[PDB]
Write a protein that binds this DNA or RNA. Structure first.
Lengths: 151, 138, 101, 105, 107, 116, 50
RNA sequence: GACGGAGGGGUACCACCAGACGUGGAGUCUGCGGCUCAAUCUGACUCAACGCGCGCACCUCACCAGGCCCGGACGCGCGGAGGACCGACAGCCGGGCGCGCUUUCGCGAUCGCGCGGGUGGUGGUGCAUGGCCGCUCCCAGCCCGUGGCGCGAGCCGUCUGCUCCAUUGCGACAACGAGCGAGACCCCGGCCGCGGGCGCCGCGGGACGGCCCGCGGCAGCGGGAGGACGGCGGGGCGAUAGCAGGUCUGUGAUGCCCUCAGACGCCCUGGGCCGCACGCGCGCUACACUGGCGGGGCCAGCCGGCGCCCGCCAGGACGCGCGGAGCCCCCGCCGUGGCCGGGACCGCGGGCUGGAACGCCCCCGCGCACCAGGAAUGUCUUGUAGGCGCCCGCCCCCACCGCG
């Protein structure tokens, strides 16, 4: 759930070759890749399986913009802990896309292929600094106060 | 695994139709009269609510496996909040008696054999439930 | 030598003081097979009191927080050896040393 | 994650800090006039070793050292201290102009 | 007011021996640890916080014992003039010395 | 008129134990997991032995500070002070009235008379 | 004598630890210290405004 | 100086505009005002009072009705030890407390008086006053040395140019140097590295207005790209000077003044602050159709323990140390019906815990108002508004409150 050694704690042996972190809105997804037979499963769960079915189409964005020959064969096991629900999906999306990037590895212009994915979706390779703010004395919420009786 | 690939909704609904032919568990009468939960607005109208709950506990049980889920644990999967009060609602548990019967009955069928902190599936049951999933996906 | 396993735990308010005691236990223990130090998640002790003694004014509140950091050191040694290590360790007054057999 | 959140010592350490505030009050009650400025107790070896940094050390000893451990003995009724297990490190505080409590006294 | 002469004389001695007392003040019924005594029935008993205070105050009021008050506590520091009056009540002897009379010297 | 399955005379002669099995939760657990205090218990035998020994019109009607003691079926037939927080309120217990605290029948409040 | 009703009541009579005040005991961590009393004694216990 | 329906510039969602969610209309609750009562303990009263002084069945507790009890220290003057005090079964009075009676029992100066003195007190005056806080203050000014100018009050620097949230600078100047505010600093994130590690947690570094282009006396100033992040992260600490602001009701912070034993001392017993037209000052839940209510896929971050067995639950037993939200998302059931909207009022039980419910929860009735809110108001620009839940503070009991 919170920054633990859960990065690889669940799996023993079968060392998965790639480790790639994806993070959106306090949700941690470490991507493990073994370059198999088209296993893109994340959270030990199918790509088609999702909390919001409509949201799955967004998490298939590297698949549509980047060549499918990449996702045609690969292997994946991702530990996603934290996040409300939709936070987990973008974090997952950051993880898998970085996981494909880690696989490209040797070609020096790996970034150039990845930037087609940034151009279609920025933050698909970048992590946002957006985090929950805090309340202050007299304030029910972070950026408000008890309604003021007199101006 | 295909038990993580069978969508939870499809697995649970499909499993209970042959459980109805099976005659496993035997949902009692007072339980089918009572409303589930201490926060539910009124009784669920599923009629076969007890039988449908029995397909709900043993699927989440496959994922829980060795760690185990006690009586409170399956109530957690269906935990709700009261929708009718002048003051704000603080979250509360569902009914303990109905949940205590569903896995105690499941111990009786030998699919679940448990002796640890609360409940764990007998391997024969884990395999068989997984086998129902094996039928479900392909 | 009845090599008992000892777990040494140190809880202290100041990080500057804590690191110095942690370094001495690691420094003293190289001869005795000391396991490296375990840093605890910070233990927050927040107390929030409206600052005003009386009720006048938009109550403004003092969040007074005390941070506790605890350090775990595993040692496999004789009962005396920790005592010999003790003279060498620099004792900061009031810092707590916990010997867990 | 497998350790009790009921770590009993975690509460114990703050008890030493209220002991420190009580000691501060204890010496503020009449030993601030004697010169008490700062205090630090050590219960790590159950020594109850307290440093009374103070403007002039000789005042508590007086002429016989009789009351020197009487302050520890006062703490003996409160915390079962033994004369000499506990110690009072009343020493010299130099540049007493820098010291504030006694400067204002 | 009935305060036993055995509670009195033994109580004076506990204060005399350590030349010290630290009691969290108690408004009413209380038992003070560190002081124990023998009743007329041969029973070992502990004195009462209400009764003990009435004597504690009296000995600091006599001036025999110096006293401090930190909110809800009495810190008693016995005086040499006090030691002689304590001997005039206990029926003990001048040679007997309070335990902190000497020995805390630090080198 | 009949109270908890017992007629007025039957409940009147019935013991405290007899009316207790069919009663409200506060009443059942008043003696079920608890009991009565020794002061409360003594008060019972300061009117009981007087209620059963009438030599004419009662000369007692004792004034008692104790108030929230659940009334007993036997104590029916007599006037109890049920002290409100200031003055005693004379209260005659009806036989159907039993099974609830003497607190309910005593008024410590002003009825209304404000609304200005 | 008075002992018969002497302080017969049994209920918490908790007080602020440093003071004799009864309100705002603030037993959050077992610090039975007072709230108005706490401001005078917070840094010594190690709490700081940060 | 301060005012100004004076001007010249600044700046702030406490100002406003483009918008947003409101509140005021509805019910419900909590705190006032105003009533009533034996008593409703009170302080506050435009921002800068009014769910606020950290959760009143008791205690708290300040007040009302009843009574017990001394705890009148230390010095002298007395009374005076088989006689100072203090306890007492019944029969009582009396909720009651051997208080005080009938009583016939015990004690043993441990003391009772007289004084002088100590003696406490949520008792008054916060226009005696400490401390601390509210505000002025989403707000930048303050003063010193030497020298100038003035009889002096005072000026000058400390500025009628520009820039900045900001005497924030850069230029220029009878001022010239200093400083204190603001900054800096610290706390948590944006990211990474080194040691490590159980509890991912300690120590470093790093976005620098650096560079590009345009303007800039120059300070700065836009448009930019790389980039975890654009030119304070979210916070704290906060000058000089004030206020007759608040608190003597937190206190061994206390002055004067009062009550000092039929006490404003201190214990018990039952009250009250939970009474109470209307009016308010916050809140909370609604008015349904992006809503219900539906079982049934769930998901956290504060940082938190579970099991088993009866019981609808409420809970209770027997135990082992151990573990997670709602909304939403599912398929359904459902016509615009004060409705299967809403959840009031209030009968009937089951419990909890507490000396004790008058506290509370659950089950089962019941279906209040209300069908989009008049003036007049607030509060806020990104993880923000709103929506939706968790934890704590207090607390046997109990959150709508507040800090998070």
């Amino acid at each position: 759930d919170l920054l633990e050694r859960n990065d690889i704690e669940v799996r023993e042996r079968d060392k998965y070759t790639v480790h790639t972190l994806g993070k959106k809105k306090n949700s941690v997804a470490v991507a493990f890749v073994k370059a198999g037979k088209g296993d893109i499963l994340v959270n030990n769960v199918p790509l088609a399986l999702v909390r919001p079915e409509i949201l799955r189409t967004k998490v298939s964005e590297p698949i549509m913009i980047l060549g499918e020959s990449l996702f045609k064969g690969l292997d994946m096991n991702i530990k996603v802990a934290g996040g409300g629900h939709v936070s987990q999906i973008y974090a997952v999306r950051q993880a898998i896309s970085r996981g494909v990037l880690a696989s490209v590895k040797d070609e020096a212009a790996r970034s150039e292929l990845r930037a087609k994915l940034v151009s279609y979706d920025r933050q698909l390779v970048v992590s946002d600094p957006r985090r929950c703010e805090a309340k202050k004395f007299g304030g029910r919420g972070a950026r408000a106060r008890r309604q003021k009786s007199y101006r | 695994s295909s038990v993580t690939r069978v969508p939870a909704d499809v697995f649970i609904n499909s499993f209970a139709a042959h459980l109805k032919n099976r005659g496993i568990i035997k949902c009692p009468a007072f339980t089918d009269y009572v409303k589930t939960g201490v926060s539910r607005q009124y009784a669920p109208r599923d009629a076969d609510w007890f039988y449908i709950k029995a397909a709900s506990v043993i699927r989440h049980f496959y994922i829980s496996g060795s760690h185990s889920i006690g009586v409170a644990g399956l109530a957690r999967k269906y935990s709700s909040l009261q929708k009718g009060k002048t003051t704000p609602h603080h979250t509360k548990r569902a009914s303990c008696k109905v949940i205590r019967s569903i896995v105690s009955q499941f111990l009786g069928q030998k699919l679940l054999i448990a002796g640890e902190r609360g409940r764990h599936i007998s391997p024969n049951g884990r395999k068989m439930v997984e086998d129902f999933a094996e039928g479900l996906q392909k | 030598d009845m090599h008992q396993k000892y777990t040494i735990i140190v809880v202290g308010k100041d990080l500057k003081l804590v690191e110095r005691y942690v370094k001495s236990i690691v420094k003293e223990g190289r001869a005795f097979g000391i396991s490296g130090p375990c840093r605890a998640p910070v233990r927050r002790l927040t107390i929030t009191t409206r600052k005003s003694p009386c009720g006048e004014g938009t109550n403004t509140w003092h969040r007074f927080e005390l941070r506790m950091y605890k350090r775990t050191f595993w040692v496999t040694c004789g009962g005396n050896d920790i005592s010999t290590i003790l003279s060498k360790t620099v004792v900061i007054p009031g810092i707590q040393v916990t010997v867990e057999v | 994650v497998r350790r009790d959140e009921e770590n009993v010592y975690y509460s114990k350490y703050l008890n030493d800090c209220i002991m420190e505030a009580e000691l501060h009050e204890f010496f503020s009650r009449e030993l601030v006039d004697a010169g008490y400025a700062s205090c630090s107790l050590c219960r790590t070896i159950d020594s109850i070793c307290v440093i009374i940094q103070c403007a002039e050390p000789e005042v508590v000893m007086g002429d016989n050292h009789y009351r020197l451990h009487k302050i520890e003995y006062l703490l003996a009724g409160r915390f079962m201290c033994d004369p000499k297990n506990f110690n009072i490190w009343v020493d010299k505080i130099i540049k007493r102009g820098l010291s504030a409590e006694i400067m204002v006294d | 007011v009935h305060i036993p002469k055995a509670v009195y004389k033994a109580v004076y001695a506990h204060l005399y021996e350590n030349a010290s007392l630290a009691l969290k003040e108690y408004w009413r019924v209380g038992n003070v640890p560190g002081i124990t005594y023998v009743d007329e029935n041969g029973k070992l008993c502990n004195p009462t916080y209400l009764h003990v205070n009435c004597i504690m105050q009296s000995l600091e009021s006599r001036g025999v014992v110096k006293d401090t008050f930190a909110w809800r506590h009495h810190y008693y520091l016995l005086t040499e003039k006090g030691e002689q009056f304590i001997r005039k009540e206990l029926d003990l002897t001048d040679d007997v010395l309070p335990t902190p009379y000497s020995k805390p010297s630090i080198k | 008129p009949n109270f908890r399955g017992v007629e007025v005379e039957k409940l009147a002669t019935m013991k405290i134990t007899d009316i207790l099995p069919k009663l409200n939760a506060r009443c059942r657990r008043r003696i079920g997991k608890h009991g009565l205090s020794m002061k409360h218990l003594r008060f019972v035998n300061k009117l009981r032995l007087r209620r059963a020994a009438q030599p004419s019109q009662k000369p007692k009607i004792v004034r008692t500070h104790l108030r929230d003691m659940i009334i007993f079926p036997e104590m029916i037939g007599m006037t109890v002070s049920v002290y409100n927080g200031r003055q005693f309120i004379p209260v005659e217990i009806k036989p159907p009235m039993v099974g609830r605290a003497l607190r309910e029948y005593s008024m410590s409040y002003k009825i209304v008379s404000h609304g200005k | 004598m008075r002992e018969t009703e002497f302080c017969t009541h049994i209920a918490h009579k908790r007080e602020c630890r440093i003071c004799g005040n009864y309100n705002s005991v603030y037993r959050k961590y077992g610090l039975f210290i007072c709230r108005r009393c706490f401001k005078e004694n917070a840094g010594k216990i190690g709490f700081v405004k940060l």
